[PDB]
Design an enzyme around this catalytic site. Structure first.
Site, mmCIF file in Angstrom:
data_model
loop_
_atom_site.group_PDB
_atom_site.id
_atom_site.type_symbol
_atom_site.label_atom_id
_atom_site.label_comp_id
_atom_site.label_asym_id
_atom_site.label_seq_id
_atom_site.Cartn_x
_atom_site.Cartn_y
_atom_site.Cartn_z
ATOM 1 N N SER A 195 0.685 -1.095 -0.125
ATOM 2 C CA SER A 195 0.283 0.323 0.087
ATOM 3 C C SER A 195 0.668 1.717 0.381
ATOM 4 O O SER A 195 -0.133 1.954 0.550
ATOM 5 C CB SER A 195 -0.678 -0.109 1.385
ATOM 6 O OG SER A 195 -2.261 -0.855 1.088
ATOM 7 N N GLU B 175 -5.505 -3.451 -6.510
ATOM 8 C CA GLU B 175 -5.964 -3.971 -4.952
ATOM 9 C C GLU B 175 -6.684 -5.552 -5.402
ATOM 10 O O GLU B 175 -7.320 -5.573 -5.765
ATOM 11 C CB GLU B 175 -6.419 -3.293 -4.210
ATOM 12 C CG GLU B 175 -5.658 -2.080 -4.014
ATOM 13 C CD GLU B 175 -3.991 -2.788 -2.527
ATOM 14 O OE1 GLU B 175 -4.157 -3.569 -2.654
ATOM 15 O OE2 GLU B 175 -3.465 -1.625 -2.449
#
Length: 266
Positions: free
Chosen positions: A43, A141
């Site tokens: 992330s 993601e």
């Protein structure tokens, strides 16, 4: 003494690979350990991702309403999964992607950059525009957290990501009004208390963006301000490729690595 020996001791104690880069400043030398080795972004890419969206739009774009469905929740999405009926503005998505590491918010911001690979090519191109020739984003993601250790996909280096953050938060990659938004969202991050923040004394300001993934991946990229207002960029990356895909990521390794860096910078 030798700071590299102290980082190597951390690798043996935590059964991990550690990467660190702190760019040189007006008053310090660079700190580098495995700084040119590849590590998965996880992330941490969300900080430059929000910069990419800021760069290529006027600030009125932050009020653009993005709609999505429950089938778009494909990744851990602490904010987005509560707003499926209303949608979220680009600004709300930026906030969620940085401060809550919201995966759906990141995927929607990637889509907002557009182009092939759902925005991943566009994001990589934004990093090329900042002089980063090594980093690449290949998956959205949550798959970008799950590549095997040998894969160059979805990787950066501590050196690369630190110099990206340096340009974004402390340099002139963004105009001041956009830079201030990125800085604020990192400053109010909710996910990083146990990583670089935990290694710096309370009177240092820390802004950050975390990353966690398979193979024990745990990352943090930060800008820290001394008690007298002197900024430093700190990138710490770690993984446990020999511990299997379900190796536990170690926030404590990042905090101790940060403590070692704080010892140099204080």
């Amino acid at each position: 003494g030798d700071l590299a020996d102290r980082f190597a001791e951390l690798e043996r104690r935590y059964d991990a690979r550690l990467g660190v880069y702190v760019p040189a400043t007006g008053t310090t030398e660079a700190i580098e350990y495995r700084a040119d080795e590849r590590f998965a972004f996880c992330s941490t890419f969300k900080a430059p991702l929000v910069a990419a969206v800021l760069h290529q739009n006027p600030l009125t774009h932050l009020d653009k309403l993005i709609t999505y469905t429950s089938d778009d929740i494909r990744s851990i999405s602490p904010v987005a999964q509560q707003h499926v009926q209303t949608g979220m503005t680009i600004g709300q998505l930026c906030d969620a992607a940085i401060r809550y590491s919201d995966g759906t918010a990141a995927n929607l911001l990637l889509a907002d950059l557009g182009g092939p690979g759902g925005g991943t090519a566009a994001f990589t191109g934004y990093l090329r525009s900042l002089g980063d020739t090594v980093s690449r984003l290949d998956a959205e993601e949550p798959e970008l957290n799950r590549d095997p250790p040998g894969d160059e996909r979805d990787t950066t280096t501590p050196h690369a990501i630190a110099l990206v953050l340096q340009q974004l938060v402390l340099g002139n990659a963004l105009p001041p009004d956009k830079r201030a938004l990125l800085t604020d969202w990192m400053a109010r991050n909710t996910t990083g208390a146990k990583r670089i923040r935990a290694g710096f004394p309370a009177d240092w300001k820390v802004i950050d963006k975390t990353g966690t993934g398979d193979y024990g991946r745990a990352n943090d990229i930060a800008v820290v301000w001394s008690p007298t207002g002197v900024p430093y960029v700190v990138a710490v990356m770690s993984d446990r490729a020999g511990g299997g895909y379900d190796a536990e990521p170690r926030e404590a390794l990042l905090a101790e690595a940060a403590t070692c860096v704080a010892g140099v910078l204080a």
